[PDB]
Amino acid sequence: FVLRDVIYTLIHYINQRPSCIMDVSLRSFSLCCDLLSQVCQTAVTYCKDALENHLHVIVGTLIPLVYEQVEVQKQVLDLLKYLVIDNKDNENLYITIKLLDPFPDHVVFKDLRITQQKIKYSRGPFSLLEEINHFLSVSVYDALPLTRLEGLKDLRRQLELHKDQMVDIMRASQDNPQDGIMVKLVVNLLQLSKMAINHTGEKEVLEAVGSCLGEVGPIDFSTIAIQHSKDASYTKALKLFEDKELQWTFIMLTYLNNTLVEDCVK
Amino acid sequence: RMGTKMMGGLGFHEVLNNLISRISMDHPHHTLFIILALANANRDEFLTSSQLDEDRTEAANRIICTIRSRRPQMVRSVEALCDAYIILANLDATQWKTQRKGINIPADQPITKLKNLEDVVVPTMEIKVDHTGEYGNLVTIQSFKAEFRLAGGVNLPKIIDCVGSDGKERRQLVKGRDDLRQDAVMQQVFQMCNTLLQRNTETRKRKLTICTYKVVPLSQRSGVLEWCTGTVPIGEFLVNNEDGAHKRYRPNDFSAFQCQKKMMEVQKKSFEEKYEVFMDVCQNFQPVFRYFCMEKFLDPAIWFEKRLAYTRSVATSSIVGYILGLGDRHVQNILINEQSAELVHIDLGVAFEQGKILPTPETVPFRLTRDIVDGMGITGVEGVFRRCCEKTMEVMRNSQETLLTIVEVLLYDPLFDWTMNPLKALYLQQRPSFNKVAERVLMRLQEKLKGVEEGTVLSVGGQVNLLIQQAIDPKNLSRLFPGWKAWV
Amino acid sequence: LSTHVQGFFTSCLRHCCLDKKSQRTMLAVVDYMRRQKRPSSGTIFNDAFWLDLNYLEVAKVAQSCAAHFTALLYAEIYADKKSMDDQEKRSTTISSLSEKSKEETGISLQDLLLEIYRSIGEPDSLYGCGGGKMLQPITRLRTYEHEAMWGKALVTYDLETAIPSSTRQAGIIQALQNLGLCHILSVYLKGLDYENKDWCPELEELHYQAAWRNMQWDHCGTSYHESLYNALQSLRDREFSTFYESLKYARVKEVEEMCKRSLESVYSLYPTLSRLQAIGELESIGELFSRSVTHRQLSEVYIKWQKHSQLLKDSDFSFQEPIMALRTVILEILMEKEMDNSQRECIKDILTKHLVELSILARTFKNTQLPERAIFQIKQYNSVSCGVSEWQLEEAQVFWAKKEQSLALSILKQMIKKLDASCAANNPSLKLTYTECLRVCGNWLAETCLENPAVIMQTYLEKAVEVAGNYDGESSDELRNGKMKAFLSLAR
Amino acid sequence: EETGISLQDLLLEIYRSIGEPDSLYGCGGGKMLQPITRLRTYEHEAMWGKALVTYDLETAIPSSTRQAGIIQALQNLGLCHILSVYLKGLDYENKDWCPELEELHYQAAWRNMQWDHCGTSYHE
Amino acid sequence: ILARTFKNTQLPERAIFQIKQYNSVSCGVSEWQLEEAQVFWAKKEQSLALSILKQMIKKLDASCAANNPSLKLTYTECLRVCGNWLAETCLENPAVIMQTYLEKAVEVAGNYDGESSDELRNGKMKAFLSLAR
Ligand SMILES: Nc1ncnc2c1ncn2[C@@H]1O[C@H](COP(=O)(O)OP(=O)(O)NP(=O)(O)O)[C@@H](O)[C@H]1O
Ligand SMILES: [Mg+2]
């Protein structure tokens, strides 16, 4: 609990900051970055699976930070290199490193991008269905649309040049069109676009979603009602309790725990 | 068509035997059971007629030897499996009629002994055809469970579980003292109709299909078929005495027993009395099938999807059964899938309008009773049902030549006993020249496919309207056999 | 709780509650209570009445909140409860229930069902609830548009005047466009602009659509068709920066407009997906227009278009036609623009193939005016040569689809005579056209009974088989398909 | 190729001049594909929708007869409002006024009771 | 009627619209509503024509009580045409068609005893022929 609270407090401190950075603001920002780095190093050293749940949000927060002044950029790249490059051999972190969003195409991100792409493609080359499944699996982690932006571009490439496999995908989804992967992808993209509404950098996310939805046009999905992705873990946790009061208690506790990572102190 | 009389350099029988041999060797998993059933026609009395039968048996034995020459292991093991199946079918099991918990299979049965038949694909499964001769990674029979369940009926069939190579159970229904070849032929026709429906855009968009199941006759009097798991008879859901839908939702109405008794009482009476009794019964018996989708699918979107699938299935099945003249569509002959709400038609022995020859003739092209329509929603037959019926009839009319050719191939099959006989008619309704008939049935099918009903050419919409009006007419429903349960 | 919740729900429809969030909260309360088992033993229908609710008002509120499936379920529940109450009181079809509901609560059940089914978008369900307002011109026009009865829709739009002018003009323009009639539509728009000075945004969008579809380049928040017209004009002017900017703006606007909807029915996504695909195709053609143009690049672009069309084979014609029209406009712009390398023949063949595909697609969807327009466009750039082409056979097929059998037969017979005079088993390309022409002519003559079987067999069917096989131009797939078709026709 | 006169064209013109409806189908093999013959066939069979579509499509036809056929097809299908707006747009697009179009405009004006539209012709 | 005879469908619709411009729907129905139903039938829109004619028949049954000689011919013709259309479309069983429409038309034409007319004689002849057929 202390680990999660400290990381979320530091992330909230980093996320909100004046556009103009003075001396004291720069000092506070550097202090936040140093404390976050120290906490991450200690947690990784003493608990291998400590960061399996907070790695995604930390990376998503740190990624925009490199498009800034060089002094904070040095700290951010050092932290990112320690988190990704220095712990590739770590078995409990290799699972979660594979699932994070791709880094933006930049010269500074060359080593991180290379490491992440090899970690993703270590098993072998990816087909279009595998790419779509990976893109959908990445979604459930962080509810920040801009962080997904680069991934969106990647998808738009595959759907551009793997259209032949889309015929096979639709053929395989014919018998059970309710859970067709393509309609699921379209619904997920529209949900992401709804999330992006009234947020920073929303137009870029909307344009990426538009390109992706233009790649797969008005294909007949053979379904009428739109279904939304539901958490199977939540449903299985609900199956355990027979008493109505126990189910109510579980629901309230889940809501309260999910609210603990919010910025508001009250 | 296999025989021995006209073998020669250019004889029909030798060429047919060579072709059948080539087909069997290229695709053993689709032909071995058929050829063995031809060879094991009279195995039932062995374990416990005309020149054509002996000729066919000898030719089937030749094909079995030719197949066994290159692949002996699979032939021997499939023969053992078929023998075990027939022995299990011949089991009496009259004592466990009252038990519904699962009876342990006796250790004497050879089916218990056999394990790990890597050469035998599960007969119940549908084997995909690959044009390359090699068949690999096919789910083969691993073992059988030690318990069998009993299914209700006059002669009690047995429900067994087969564990395959992947270790996943499959339920099979083993039947004796009954002919399953008619059901297999009807399933073949259903598959061809499904293929016709698939390749037309209008019916492919609506996903109009006929639910099918695999039937493997093992002899002239025994067989094993796919058990449709997750399905319940519509009569069981509707008019079960203990917890039926009619009893649960309408406690103050007539009981199903009361309606049945009232209907039997008026059987030996005038037609006017039959009609008035039917109207009185329908007044005190209201349909409740709309609650099937409501209680199972609480989510409105899933409920709407399942109801639409049910309506489309009813429309497609009605049109296809009318084209094939399917009869004996009583409440126990139709099942509904609990997961998908789609209808499955079983007991396809009566077809080609032979039910009209019955003592109490069937006056309806299909079953469209009040419960069936009530299951379609507040709109009833109007909307999805009528449009889907029109689409299916349009596809049927556009493919009249192919359908007529397929039915021609069917009707002249020597082993297809599709005509009605007095013994079958009496068994169907019990209470406490062939060429001429084939040509007449073919011409009637041609008239149906061309839209001619009473000598007048009708459009697709007009023909659909006429069929719906005939099916929902209370006057026709009042004349039907009480076992049909037209009020349900 | 029953009286207060019923009061809240009737306050929504009094029109007082006007906040969507509160209505959604109370609908969620009702939905949760619907799924709970009452303490007394009972059924799910009994569980639907934890409170003494009037489910018709709840269904109307849910439809207002764009919960279409929930509204349908609640309307069914209300109808069932009303029927049960009537039966109990006495101890009626949709029209009678609608009349009673209108005289009790003021909501017509039949109208609500029709609106719910229109919102859902399932085509067949629109025929289930018809008995209400059959004679009303709006329902008739909606039925005509749904069945693509564009002539009837145009006649009814012109006749009825009580319809508001905006929707009347929109329907007139849509019916004119769907029947071709580009010149008539343009003159009608000119007269409409002459007769009125005030300009409503929807008419402006329709005018821009007609301008870009007809290649009227002097017609010049931004809407979709305005953005398309601006992008096409910029591409013609080789203004690439503003071209990409306009395409990006249109893409963002389409996505944003899709974001504010309910996201409940799949049918609501198709127009947006079609528009986005059209925008993407135009953007892809932009890069090709920017740099040098070669045969290979055009071939790959057309192959990608054909692959995407194959992916769209089960889509409705209303979602495929705009993409085809944009492709035709793009190809015609590419040909018309500066081409001094004499390799415009490649674009000519590509546009001919695209227009043949469009004619085939329109024929499949029972449309006859669009294939004729496509044939006219083909004849604009092509001519009649000794070596015939496939578009003449397509024109014969189009004339056959128009129930003009004599014209199609004459065209095909002239085609066959020209092929016989010209070809001498020398051109592999002409072989397939000759075989198909012979087979189709034989089949048509057999169908029309205009020729005796002996001549049909001697001159057309066996001749097609002989041309396909004895010429020995083997090692091809289209040749194999043509041989199979000729063999099947002769066998039949 | 001998005298320069096509017998089939002469027969078609003679039968059109005579005016017997069935005889127009006897000599058809000549100029079946020509748009003018197709439009004449459509008008003879009262196929006003097909005639309108063909008139709108074909542009090589002279403007006067094309517009006359368009107006006739619109009138025969009803479409009084569409015809009036089309006439307004046509008058907007052209200042020169040929007598046949004036006669058609007067016919549309009196048929639609447009009383503000105001050798003399019949419809005038 | 003339435009329907010459296989024209737009002109009858325009004429029906012009009629509805000056007329309205009253308890005592008129012949132009039957003409509109015939026009809709000629448009191959059978459901609309049947609905219009059934509404016409219901209104006539509610209003007329064998009192208006003018309404008698319209009622008889509406019943006969509805019966013929239902027979042609196979949308109703023969028993209901005979009980509700054809014999009802004959009874309205004859038992009302509004004799001494020529149009009445023609309508009676047509109803008798339809029932006989
Ligand atoms: N393919 C199947 N899938 C699932 N359940 C089935 C299947 N076939 C039969 N049943 C069930 O078994 C019951 C017995 O039906 P059936 O096998 O037709 O024997 P029956 O009632 O005696 N008719 P029959 O044997 O032909 O005289 C049915 O009512 C169903 O409940
Ligand atoms: Mg049975």
Residue numbers in the entry:
A (entry chain A): 1463 to 1728
B (entry chain A): 2526 to 2573, 2591 to 2974, 3001 to 3056
C (entry chain A): 1862 to 1876, 1899 to 1974, 1984 to 2112, 2121 to 2392
D (entry chain B): 1995 to 2112, 2121 to 2126
E (entry chain B): 2260 to 2392
Sentences from the study reporting this entry:
Ataxia-telangiectasia mutated (ATM) is a large protein kinase with a central role in the cellular response to DNA double-strand breaks (DSBs) and related genotoxic stress. ATM, which belongs to the phosphatidylinositol 3-kinase-like protein kinase (PIKK) family, is essential for the sensing of DSBs during the cell cycle. MRN contributes to the localization of ATM to DSBs, and together with double-stranded DNA (dsDNA), it activates ATM as a protein kinase.
Cryo-EM samples were prepared by mixing ATM with the non-hydrolyzable ATP analog adenylyl-imidodiphosphate (AMP-PNP) and MgCl2. The cryo-EM data yielded a consensus reconstruction in point group C2 that extended to an overall resolution of 2.5 Å as determined from gold standard Fourier shell correlation (FSC = 0.143). The refined model contains over 90% of the ATM residues, with the remaining residues in poorly-ordered or disordered loops. The ATM FAT domain plays a central role in dimerization, which buries ~3800 Å2 of surface area on each ATM protomer (Krissinel and Henrick, 2007)., the kα9b helix occludes part of the putative substrate-binding site, and the packing of the coiled coil against it may well stabilize this autoinhibitory conformation. The adenine ring is sandwiched between hydrophobic or aromatic residues from the N lobe (Leu2715, Leu2767, and Trp2769) and C lobe (Leu2877 and Ile2889), whereas the N6 and N1 groups hydrogen bond to backbone carbonyl and amide groups of Glu2768 and Cys2770, respectively. The Mg2+ ion, which contacts the AMP-PNP α phosphate group, is coordinated by Asn2875 and Asp2889 of the C lobe – interactions conserved among both PIKKs and canonical protein kinases. In this superposition, the ATM N lobe is positioned remarkably similar to those of inactive mTOR and inactive DNA-PKcs, with the three N lobes forming a tightly clustered set clearly distinct from the cluster of active mTOR and active DNA-PKcs N lobes. The positions of the N lobe hairpin and other ATP-interacting residues relative to the C lobe catalytic and magnesium-coordinating residues are much closer to those of the inactive mTOR and DNA-PKcs structures compared the active ones. This positioning thus suggests that in addition to relieving the blockage of the substrate-binding site, the activation of ATM may well involve a conformational change within the FAT domain and the associated change in the relative orientation of the N and C lobes of the kinase domain. Our cryo-EM structure of human ATM shows an overall symmetric dimer, albeit with the Pincer and Spiral domains exhibiting some mobility arising from conformational flexibility within the Pincer domain.
